[PDB]
Design a protein around this ligand. Structure first.
Ligand SMILES: CCCCCCCCCCCCCCCCCC(=O)OC[C@H](COP(=O)(O)OCCN)OC(=O)CCCCCCCCCCCCCCCCC
Ligand SMILES: CCCCCCCCCCCCCCCCCC(=O)OC[C@H](COP(=O)(O)OCCN)OC(=O)CCCCCCCCCCCCCCCCC
Ligand SMILES: CCCCCCCCCCCCCCCCCC(=O)OC[C@H](COP(=O)(O)OCCN)OC(=O)CCCCCCCCCCCCCCCCC
Ligand SMILES: CCCCCCCCCCC1=C(C)C(=O)C(OC)=C(OC)C1=O
Ligand SMILES: CCCCCCCCCCCCCCCCCCCC
Ligand SMILES: CCCCCCCCCCCCCCCCCCCC
Ligand SMILES: CCCCCCCCCCCCCCCCCCCC
Ligand SMILES: CCCCCCCCCCCCCCCCCCCC
Lengths: 322, 100, 467, 162, 300, 129
């Protein structure tokens, strides 16, 4: 196995494995950072006793989750019940598998890109649907119906929000998209696209204020009430990986990704991704949760025509300067 | 390098399986599912045909095929909701009062 | 190749019908007014009908890789526009009794007219498929318009499932044909050929299955009496006239412009389908007590006669004008008969001795029953004479014998209906009067062009496409 | 490239067969999702990346509303599966099975009778499909938009409760 | 002529009427609570909602109604009670609010304690109220005794009841904002509650159930330095309250979740005995502290 | 070349390690930790009281109209996906086609909004007065 091509293949495989382990570890540490950042936002501390600064709280959480019993209810459909946390964990991971974190550091240099992210979101909704239906609980069924209504709300304009970025870059590849922002970042020309993609990406992960399927005040924790042990942890870890994936994708699509004046490119990418992660937590702490019929009306009557007009104006501007 | 005949045979197998699910199944939802299977099989055959000749015409015909598939699925879903609302069952063999 | 302003000049009916679809949409969204949107739909259809004159003044051109416009497309566009106008005129008094919304009917009729125009202008496989689906989907809406009624829902479900299956069959045959040839144009089917190859033959057979469903051809004809009876009477009028006219026009365009029409096997199976269609459609209407199922079997028989006229297209040069004359006469007769049925069914709530309370409608109905039988002094006889001349010229003796036998059976049941109009049985609004005027002009046109058919021959022969 | 195409084709065939012969609607929808994923994999192996992308993008939402309607009416416990089981009998499915088999073998005879040169697997990007879609094929796009509008109008008119 | 005369405080499998004089008041009179499998099954069948008893009509031709227990174990339920919802999809067809799960027998306890020793039980009637719960009982006992308390007693009692009113209103506003969806202001509102609790701990010696009012006065005098903590709270409060307003109460999402939701007029407020903020929100200016002034509220 | 097969192998290893890690933590959660036994352990959670009927009832979603509109709008979205990647080579004429397409899309959307569709909230929940 002594050849430059084979060691290049091994190096690329090792880089992909490093990216995967780093993003999974970042999702778990992002759960811990959500606890700490909610404490910071709410004039408190959060966990700062388990080790120095609470750094071992995530380890104790993992040990407890692994040694909490994992059960499958007798009234549930066992195969779908076990299948749903796997989809919730893996769909947004595969969505992250196309994000370029640095020049020369990417898992898949697909020619579809944002199309693959749309595919993974449309596959990620089925995890919540399967969890809601399979557990055979009334609150879970209500949460699954709310999640389906939410997908009806957001998926109409989820791709049309980024079609302005695709039109400006002239391609579907993320590398071409971050290379098209060499002069100015895409948040300034595509600002309506920016806010519509922010709404749709918060709705993708079912994060607050869009936490309709799992609203504790409304449905008493919602669809995953029968889940426990490492399936419940799979749901939460997949949600946090989704947060990281949506933050990184928004950084690459609207803020240049790794492009920066002085710092190394990975430093800029990590800074902007952590900025949007703490913005996820700030959004959760800040604003209340709207009714899901109001969410559907806002996503259909407002966001979809906004994305259509933004795409038309972007096309006119592009063809004017061509 | 991949034979066109194998792709066309795959599409034909999926088409006849969709027609089998269309005929032998009595619930209207499974007839719509089988119809989706046939329209996807015909679209698949169009993509193999376009990929053999190296043209975008097969992909454009696939786009038209799935536009028709979505529109017919919505129409059939509305008609099935009407049937379930005014009959309270999805038996398609009871739709037989018009004969002779 | 790009789009020139002369191309949009030739694109006038399609653009006008699309514009009035959008205008009717916006007027419905502004306020639910039945009369305003009905008048808008009639105005748009008439605007397309008079823009046909500017299309004729433009000329024949291949406007797209998809479309080709000539006298052929002009004639079939005019036929489907007349059918759509009559459908709206018959539909308004029927819609006066509809308790639910009455505004989507004209939108669906306009969209189906757009599909018929695009079928008339089709010169591509993609255009053919899109036109078939654009005819079928508003027909799914219109057939099940009165979904509270059981039979309309039955016909809607049957038509939707069967037409989706036929569209899947047609699309699979299309994909096999495209895998064989490599071009979807109407002139490049088998240009690389040894004209008989199994993949192209199977693809054309599956398209034949789909189109024979759409043309009520045996053995894809079982939907026709059920869908015709279940649907509302203006919807039955539209499905009998415009859908059949547009789909048979695009069938003739495909079988004329392609080199595959010279193949003997497709001609043989089309002769078998035509024979079976004529005999089965005429025999099935012998003991029919319902007028809608009888007219459905009548449509099957008349499409069989059109098939006989189409089979001899490669040999004789007079088959196309025969199909044009027969389709004009069939359109007028079906418009009159289904208009009498619609005016008797209007307004919507939920024919023995008709002369003693409605004499003019009985006169129109018996004239159209004489016309559908191929009896002289009517246009249907002129069409049957053209079909028989075309069959005799190319020596199709089984087909003309089937035509004679089916004409005798049609004579029996049509004349039974005609005398039942005059036996002894045991409105007041200008829209109903407009429908009565429409069926009266249909009957008068049938009688006048049966006595003196030569102007129709001149108009049809002047509608000459690229040979 | 052959391995991915053949494995996805076999998975699509098996999942379609399990779809058409199943009584559980949610399990049938899951196997339909698997079959369409396999169809998109077949599309991706042939170089039509846009076709597989649209197969997963637009059919994940299509089967989603199918799941919505399945939850809306079909789920009743074991009663719906029991009712669906009575409609399926050995004679009932053995009737059209030979018809589907003879149709499949006729189509296979047709397929094997054509010439072949092999699919080279050269990828076709979405840029070329977009150029052809909004270039030579204008009226297909416009009248397909009108077709989808017509289907939407039909869905509104039929699907109303009152 | 009553429509559905069934037990509302006791379970349906309860023998005897507890507020009668011959019924034993204490749990030690009866056998100690023995939870067996048979008793658990019988009480679970008793607690199961039976829609045929309420005429709920558990079905429609198109679809089936959904019967959901909102409570006892729900985050939205403010205690141990349950609303049984008949639903179609998400819409509520009818509700049966089932109460009696939080019955402590406090009136029978009033027949069981002395006049002085009943004051802590009055404190737990409305556990966010405290001295506000204490005042009507001690005022009624003073009416019975013929006691006219001096001015200082009235001012101290008004102080403690307004402090606990601010405490209860802070909890109510934070709880409402939490159920609308914003989970941040509850922390700060409970910090202000801790400031009030510092003052109340200084005065009464207890946080939440002070039991500090007495017949004819209060338990102790004010300790030296209470005005310092009162000034601290009065300086700390209004900026925090304005922050709560401008952060959550002026939120358009909160307004969308709140405005127009569960609205009734003065007729519904009067026919159902609605008092407090709802009755004044219907426009009827009827407050007890002004209409029938008690404890020297006329001086404020 | 070499970069393409290296990227394909990296993507395949990403998929394999992700699925295997999910399976491994599922197995570790299932195998570690003692089980609990209770009389009412295998009962659906309904706030502590037995259910009325079951959770397998048919539930009338009010947004099914919006769902069958969502499929159509998703197909319009795929058409705009195809257009948006090739805007510069389509020219101004292609911009005219897409403008007509999007104008028909908003015409259908305004039609859906105005006729009472996309509005399934009850009369008591419309926030009037
Ligand atoms: C990396 C990804 C993450 C990035 C993080 C940063 C961005 C996160 C974005 C979060 C977006 C949350 C959007 C929430 C929308 C809720 C809309 C809604 O349902 O509003 C309903 C409410 C009342 O409904 P109404 O229509 O009035 O009543 C009808 C009843 N008869 O109506 C209203 O309240 C009316 C006003 C609606 C306002 C909609 C939201 C505006 C845009 C989002 C907030 C700003 C986000 C940051 C933007 C950049 C700031 C520098
Ligand atoms: C059971 C698990 C799933 C098994 C089937 C899917 C994986 C099969 C193994 C694929 C291994 C990689 C491979 O064969 O790649 C070939 C090809 C690479 O792409 P291309 O550029 O066309 O190739 C030329 C390279 N110079 O690849 C392609 O062109 C596309 C490869 C297939 C499509 C992606 C994977 C689809 C997965 C569907 C899952 C369905 C549900 C299970
Ligand atoms: C189990 C899966 C094992 C790995 C399967 C193969 C992965 C690699 C692959 O599919 O490569 C093909 C394609 C990338 O090819 P690309 O770089 O775009 O083209 C070459 C440049 N001319 O990449 C693609 O087509 C990627 C899109 C399909 C990937 C599907 C992955 C699974 C999704 C469903 C999970 C449930
Ligand atoms: C964990 C983050 C802070 C939570 C603070 C909750 C404050 C009280 C919430 C309201 C409430 C009260 C008073 C309450 O009594 C109750 O019933 C037991 C509830 O349901 C669980 C409530 O939600
Ligand atoms: C909070 C930040 C989250 C980042 C998620 C993605 C990280 C993927 C792992 C990247 C590892 C390699 C970093 C770049 C190496 C080459 C440059 C080195 C100098 C900066
Ligand atoms: C026994 C008396 C029968 C009287 C029949 C009268 C028929 C009158 C017909 C009027 C013209 C109708 C159209 C004929 C073509
Ligand atoms: C019932 C229909 C009967 C049709 C008979 C047609 C007979 C045709 C004979 C043709 C002979 C051709 C000889 C050369
Ligand atoms: C209650 C009504 C049920 C109707 C079921 C219809 C099932 C039809 C099955 C047909 C099977 C045909 C098998 C081949 C027959 C020979 C070839 C075709 C005829 C020549």
């Amino acid at each position: 196995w002594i050849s430059p091509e084979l060691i290049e293949i091994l190096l690329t495989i090792l880089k992909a494995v490093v990216i995967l382990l780093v993003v999974v570890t970042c999702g778990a540490f992002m759960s811990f950072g959500e606890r700490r950042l909610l404490g910071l936002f709410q004039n408190r501390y959060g966990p700062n006793r388990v080790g120095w600064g609470g750094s071992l709280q995530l380890v104790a959480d993992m040990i407890k989750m692994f040694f909490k019993e994992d059960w499958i209810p007798k009234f549930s459909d066992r195969v779908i019940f076990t299948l749903a946390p796997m989809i919730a964990f893996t769909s947004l991971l595969l969505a992250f598998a196309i994000v370029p974190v640095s020049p020369g550091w990417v898992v898949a240099d697909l020619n579809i890109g944002i199309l693959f992210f749309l595919m993974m979101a449309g596959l990620a909704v089925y995890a919540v649907l399967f969890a809601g239906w399979s557990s055979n609980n009334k609150y879970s069924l209500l949460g699954a119906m709310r999640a389906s209504a939410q997908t009806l709300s957001y998926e109409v304009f989820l791709g049309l929000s980024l079609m302005g970025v695709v039109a400006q870059a002239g391609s579907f590849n993320m590398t071409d998209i971050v290379n098209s922002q060499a002069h100015v970042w895409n948040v300034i020309p595509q600002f309506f696209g920016f806010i519509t993609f922010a709404i749709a990406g918060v709705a993708v992960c079912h994060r607050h204020p869009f936490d309709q399927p799992e609203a504790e005040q409304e449905l008493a924790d919602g669809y995953h009430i029968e889940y426990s042990g490492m399936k419940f942890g799979l749901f939460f870890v997949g949600e946090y990986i989704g947060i990281v994936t949506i933050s990184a994708l928004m950084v690459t699509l609207f803020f240049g990704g790794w492009q920066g004046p002085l710092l190394p490119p990975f430093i800029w990418f990590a800074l902007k991704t952590a900025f949007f992660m703490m913005m996820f937590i700030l959004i959760r702490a800040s604003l209340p949760r709207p009714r899901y019929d109001q969410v559907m009306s806002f996503g259909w009557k407002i966001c979809l025509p906004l994305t259509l007009i933004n795409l038309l104006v972007t096309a006119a501007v592009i063809l004017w300067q061509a | 390098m991949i034979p066109l005949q194998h792709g066309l045979i795959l599409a034909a197998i999926l088409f006849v399986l969709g027609l089998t699910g269309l005929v032998i199944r009595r619930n209207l939802l499974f007839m719509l599912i089988g119809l989706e299977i046939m329209i996807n099989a015909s679209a698949l055959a169009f993509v193999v045909a376009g990929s053999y000749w190296g043209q975008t015409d097969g992909q454009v015909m696939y786009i038209l095929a799935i536009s028709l598939a979505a529109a017919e699925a919505s129409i059939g879903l509305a008609l099935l909701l009407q049937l379930h609302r005014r009959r309270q069952n999805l038996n398609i063999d009871s739709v037989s009062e018009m004969r002779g | 190749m790009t789009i020139t302003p002369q191309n949009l000049i030739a694109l006038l009916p399609l653009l006008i019908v699309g514009l009035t679809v959008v205008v009717v949409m916006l007027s419905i969204a502004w306020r639910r007014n039945h009369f305003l949107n009905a008048t808008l739909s009639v105005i748009g259809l008439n605007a397309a009908l008079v823009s046909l004159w500017f299309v004729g003044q433009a000329g024949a051109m291949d406007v797209t890789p998809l479309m080709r416009v000539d006298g052929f497309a002009m004639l079939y566009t005019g036929l489907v526009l007349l059918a759509s106008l009559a459908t709206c005129t018959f539909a308004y008094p029927w819609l006066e009794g509809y308790n639910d919304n009455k505004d989507e009917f004209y939108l669906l009729v306009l969209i189906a007219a757009l599909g018929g125009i695009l079928l008339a202008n089709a010169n591509h496989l993609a255009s053919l498929f899109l036109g078939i689906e654009l005819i079928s989907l508003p027909l799914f809406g219109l057939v099940g318009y009165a979904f509270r009624q059981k039979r309309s829902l039955e016909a809607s479900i049957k038509y939707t499932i069967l037409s989706a299956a036929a569209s899947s069959f047609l699309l699979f045959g299309m994909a096999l044909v495209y895998a064989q040839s490599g071009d979807l144009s109407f002139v490049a089917l088998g240009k690389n050929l040894m004209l008989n190859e199994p993949l192209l033959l199977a693809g054309f057979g599956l398209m034949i299955v789909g189109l024979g469903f759409k043309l009520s051809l045996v053995p894809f004809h079982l939907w026709t009496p059920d869908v015709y009876q279940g649907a509302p009477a203006p919807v039955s009028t539209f499905l009998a006239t415009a859908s059949k006219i547009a789909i048979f026009g695009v069938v003739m365009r495909l079988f004329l412009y392609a080199p595959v029409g010279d193949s003997e096997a497709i001609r043989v199976v089309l002769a078998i389908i035509a024979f079976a269609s004529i005999i089965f459609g005429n025999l099935m209407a012998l003991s029919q007590t319902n007028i809608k199922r009888l007219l459905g079997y009548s449509s099957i028989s008349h499409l069989g006669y059109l098939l006989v006229a189409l089979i001899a297209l490669q040999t004789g040069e007079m088959s196309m004008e025969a199909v044009g004359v027969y389709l004009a006469g069939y359109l007028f007769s079906s418009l009159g008969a289904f208009g009498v049925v619609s005016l008797m069914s209007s307004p919507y709530r939920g024919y023995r001795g008709l002369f003693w309370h409605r004499p003019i409608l009985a006169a129109v109905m018996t004239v159209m029953m004489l016309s559908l039988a191929g009896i002289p002094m009517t246009l249907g006889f002129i069409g049957k004479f053209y079909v028989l001349a075309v069959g005799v010229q190319a020596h199709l003796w089984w087909l003309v014998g089937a035509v004679v036998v089916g004409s005798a059976i049609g004579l029996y049941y049509y004349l039974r209906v005609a005398v039942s109009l005059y036996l002894h049985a045991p409105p007041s609004n200008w829209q109903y009067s407009a429908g009565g005027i429409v069926v009266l002009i249909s009957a008068l046109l049938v009688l006048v062009l049966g006595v003196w058919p030569q102007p129709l021959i001149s108009i049809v022969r002047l509608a000459m496409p690229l040979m | 490239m052959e391995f991915a195409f053949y494995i996805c084709g076999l998975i699509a065939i098996l999942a379609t067969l399990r779809v058409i012969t199943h009584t559980n609607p949610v399990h049938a929808l899951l196997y339909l999702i698997i079959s369409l994923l396999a169809i998109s994999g077949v599309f991706f192996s042939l170089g039509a990346y846009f076709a597989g992308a649209l197969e997963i993008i637009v059919y994940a939402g299509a089967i989603m509303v199918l799941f919505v309607f399945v939850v809306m009416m079909l789920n009743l416990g074991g009663s719906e599966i029991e009712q669906e089981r009575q409609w399926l009998k050995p004679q009932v499915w053995i009737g059209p099975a030979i018809l589907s088999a003879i149709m499949l073998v006729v189509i296979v005879y047709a397929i094997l009778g054509v010439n072949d040169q092999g699919i080279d697997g050269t990828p076709i990007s979405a840029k070329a499909v977009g150029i052809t879609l909004f270039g030579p094929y204008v009226l297909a796009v416009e009248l397909a938009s009108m077709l989808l509008l017509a289907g939407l109008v039909v869905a509104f008119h039929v699907g109303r409760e009152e | 002529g009553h429509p559905n005369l069934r037990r509302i405080m006791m379970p349906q499998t309860w023998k005897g009427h507890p507020l009668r004089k011959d019924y034993p008041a204490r749990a030690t009179e009866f056998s100690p609570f023995e939870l067996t499998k048979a008793k658990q099954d019988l009480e679970m069948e008793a607690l199961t909602f039976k829609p045929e008893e309420w005429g709920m009509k558990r079905g429609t031709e198109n679809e089936d109604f959904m019967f959901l227990n909102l409570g006892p174990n729900h985050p939205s339920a403010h205690g141990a009670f349950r609303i049984v919802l008949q639903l179609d999809g998400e819409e509520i067809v009818d509700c049966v609010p089932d109460i009696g799960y939080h019955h402590r027998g406090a009136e029978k306890m009033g027949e069981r304690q002395s006049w002085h020793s009943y004051i802590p039980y009055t404190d737990r009637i409305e556990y966010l109220g405290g001295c506000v719960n204490e005042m009507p009982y001690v005022l009624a006992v003073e009416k019975l005794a013929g006691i006219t308390v001096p001015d200082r007693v009235n001012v101290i009692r008004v102080m403690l009841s307004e402090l606990f009113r601010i405490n209860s209103h802070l909890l109510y506003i934070s709880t409402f904002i939490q159920d609308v969806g914003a989970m941040t202001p509850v922390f700060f509102a409970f910090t202000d509650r801790q400031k009030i609790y510092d003052l109340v701990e200084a005065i009464t010696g207890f946080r939440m159930h002070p039991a500090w009012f007495r017949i004819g006065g209060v338990a102790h005098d004010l300790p030296r330095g209470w005005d310092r903590l009162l000034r601290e709270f009065l300086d700390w409060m209004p900026k925090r309250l304005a922050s709560y307003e401008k952060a959550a109460l002026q939120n358009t999402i909160l307004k969308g979740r709140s405005q127009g939701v569960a609205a009734y007029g003065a007729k519904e407020a009067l026919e159902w005995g609605t008092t407090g903020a709802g009755l004044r929100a219907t426009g009827i200016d009827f407050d007890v502290r002004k209409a029938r002034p008690y404890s020297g509220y006329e001086n404020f | 070349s070499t970069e393409v097969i290296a990227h394909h192998w990296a993507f395949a290893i990403f998929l394999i390690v992700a699925i295997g890690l999910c399976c491994l933590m599922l197995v570790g959660g299932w195998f570690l930790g003692g089980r609990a036994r209770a009389r009412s352990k295998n009962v659906p959670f309904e706030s502590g009281i037995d259910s009325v009927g079951s959770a397998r009832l048919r539930l009338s979603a009010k947004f099914y109209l919006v769902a069958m509109f969502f499929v159509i709008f998703d197909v319009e979205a795929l058409y705009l996906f195809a257009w948006s990647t090739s805007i510069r080579e389509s020219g101004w004429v292609g911009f005219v086609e897409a403008a007509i397409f999007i104008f028909v899309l908003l015409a259908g959307l305004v039609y859906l909004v105005r006729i009472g569709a996309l509005d399934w909230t009850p009369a008591r929940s419309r926030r009037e007065r």
